[PDB]
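Fig. S4 source data, part A: sequence.
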Amino acid sequence: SACFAKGTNVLMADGSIECIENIEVGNKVMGKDGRPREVIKLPRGSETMYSVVQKSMPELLKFTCNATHELVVRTPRSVRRLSRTIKGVEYFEVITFEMGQKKAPDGRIVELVKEVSKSYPVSEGPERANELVESYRKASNKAYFEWTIEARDLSLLGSHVRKATYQTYAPIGAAFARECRGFYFELQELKEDDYYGITLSDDSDHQFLLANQVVVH
C-alpha cells in the first residue's frame, strides 16, 4: 500500500531510520501519532513515478512515490461569498467546497473535493445566504476535509481546491505529543522505475512517518 522510490528513508518506531527497501515483514514503523505500526507485506514492482516537492529557510520536504500511491491530504472547508449579476439580477453567490466525485479521463470515478455554488437574489435579503454559510460551517465537526488521492489523480482537482490542498508533517512539540503542520506542494510525473512498498496491519490506521516527518500511507 505505501510505495516509494528506492532509498526513501522511513522513520521506524524506535526513532531510527531505514531505507524502504530494507524494511522487512514484522518491522515497526513510526505511526503518525508516535506509536508503532506493523509491516505485514512488502509489495514491489515497476510503475510510473511522481516527485513530490514542498512549495514554500528549512529544507523543502520531498519524496518520490508511484502513480497509484495515495497522498494523505487536507483541504479547508472553504466558503466564499461573491457578488455577481446575471441578466440584470444581483446575487449573493455562496461557493463551498464539498466532497464529491469526478470521472478521470480513463473513466475511473475518483472521490475528491470540489466547488459547489448556490445563488440567492440580493433583493430577497442576506438572510438565506447567511443561513447557508452557517449550516455549512456547522455540518462537520472538523474545519477541513481529511482525505486521500492517488498521485496521478491530483491533476483532477479544480484550481481553487488544488491550490488550497496540503500535505502534513508531524514534528514533536512541547508536551511530548506529535503536532501536525501543513505544507503546500507540487507534483511532477516521472517515468517508470522500480518501487518498494510496505503494507501495514489493520490493527491501527495505516498512516506513518517518513524520515522527514511527512505523513504518508
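Fig. S4 source data, part B ends here. The longest strand covers residues 185-200.
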